[PDB]
Amino acid sequence: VGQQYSSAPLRTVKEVQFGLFSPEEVRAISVAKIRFPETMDETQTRAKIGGLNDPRLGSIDRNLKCQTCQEGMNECPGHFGHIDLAKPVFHVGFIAKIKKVCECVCMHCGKLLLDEHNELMRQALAIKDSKKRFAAIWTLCKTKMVCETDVPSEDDPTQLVSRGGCGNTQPTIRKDGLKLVGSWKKDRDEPELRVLSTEEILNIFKHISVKDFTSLGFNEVFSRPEWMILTCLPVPPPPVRPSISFNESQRGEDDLTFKLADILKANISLETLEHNGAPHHAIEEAESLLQFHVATYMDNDIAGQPQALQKSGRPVKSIRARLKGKEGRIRGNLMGKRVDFSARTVISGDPNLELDQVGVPKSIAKTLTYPEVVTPYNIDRLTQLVRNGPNEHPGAKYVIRDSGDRIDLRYSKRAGDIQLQYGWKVERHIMDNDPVLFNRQPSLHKMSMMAHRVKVIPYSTFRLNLSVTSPYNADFDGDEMNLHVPQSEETRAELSQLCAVPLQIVSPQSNKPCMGIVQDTLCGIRKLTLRDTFIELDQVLNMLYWVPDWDGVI
């Protein structure tokens, strides 16, 4: 899967170390600068300016190039770029914490506001639990607003011991849009309000003690508070924000590929004001802009309304939106995907299929396939299916040799030729008795998905046995059902050995069978029973011939 051999050893993931990016690593990683805000056009001349997407980064147009990394599109994951911001911005999401953190430490010096010296504090420092430590720490020191230089130790409340210094009063803080402000109280009166410049906050976080990081739910290696503020900006590669070219002389740039363009724009304009006629505070009207676009690009569904609508009224899917539950990467593309080797049509009952059988129309049997591996046990049966072509029923449509290459049976000028080679794989049609998984959504049972024996049949319906009805909880009032075809010898095994219908007969949810006899067969079995009911020879002979296991003894 992925195609092409790689001398790289392969292993399975066993741990996920979460963290935040270090502005430096962002550069280390980056393979492209990204200084231009445009797409390409070397002055209309189609290509890609060493500016945005592909200044070395991933590619488009079906061209190997990817910093010789070649491979061309398929095989080449994207290659992150970066973009040196002009001034430090918050991280739309971390803002709540960047804040709560400030209320836990003081400015000017940058150290805790409660040492082992304060007792109610010690207790919180024993709570081994990054989440509940930082959740007790905050509740304690959010109240004390003065960087105490001397406190009464484990002795007399008369003897004052010392530690750090500079009691500079601590301003309480509150949130407003994408900025943090606080008031400093002076006695004698009246407050003093000022905005906390990012550059300032960031600074106070760098100084924070290495053991302070820790005590406050962080990690010296992976996530240092000083990283919740963005210096350098990782620029996702094409495959994350693919374009969509409508042939050639047409655009199609993704949504994301735009906010970068905007973030990039509102950045270059900022710098051009810090090295030119700097009307000082006509910049924070264009700096508050960068804080915005780089807030949006990640999250667009905030409290302080301004939706940042693309030119058209369309909201603009933020990165967060892509992941957000249901229909989104996590719940939509990873916890549940669309799969191949599946089929769905209309179900109809048929009192002529063993419980575990399931009728598959020839149409579908000739569409769905199963990779069999050319073994001397079937080299014959297989060369037959292969010659049979992909049109007659018992046949096949694809033969794949060791040299990882697929021969298309319905075109290949050698379709009728071909001798097979042990080890080759021949994709054949689903044949009578190929364990399959059948089911009917909404699935809330172990039972809603069972393994059946394939029974190819004419007419376009999934012909299931009656008694296996109630388990899927279906009827034929125009109902549909899904069928999935196993793909590895060991897979079928799992279906046939645990999933098979005959196994699901006694249900563990009520420690009693879950399939019985219904409708006709039920109704008729009562009539046929009665003392009153009698049957004569000529017919009691046809009935005996109908029980397949009849010992031949009238």
Binding site: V1, G2, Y5, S6, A8, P9, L10, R11, T12, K14, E15, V16, Q17, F18, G19, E25, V26, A28, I29, Q67, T68, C69, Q70, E75, P77, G78, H79, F80, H91, F222, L233, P234, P236, P237, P239, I319, R322, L323, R329, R331, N333, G336, K337, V339, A343, L437, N439, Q441, P442, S443, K446, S448, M449, N482, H484, Q487, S488, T491, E494, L498
Partner: protein, 97 residues
Amino acid sequence: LRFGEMERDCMIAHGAASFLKERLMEASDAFRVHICGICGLMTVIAKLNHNQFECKGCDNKIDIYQIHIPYAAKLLFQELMAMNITPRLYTDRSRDF
């Protein structure tokens, strides 16, 4: 056709491990990326031809693994990175337990 959440749930109940894994992978995404044996990232600049592997920044060429994951997952990670979050991929356990 879709093998959405609820479909998963049933297979998990059945205990049909291999199969579930097979629907999600071989019959869908299934992709092969490269990782740094050091920083659990996808930086890895494998030219898979002249065997060259590198990964400057972490600066490697000797410790590099290859893994199989759903392309939608490779994507999940890449998206998280662009939001400045680091999802590490480690091929061995160290926390124990």
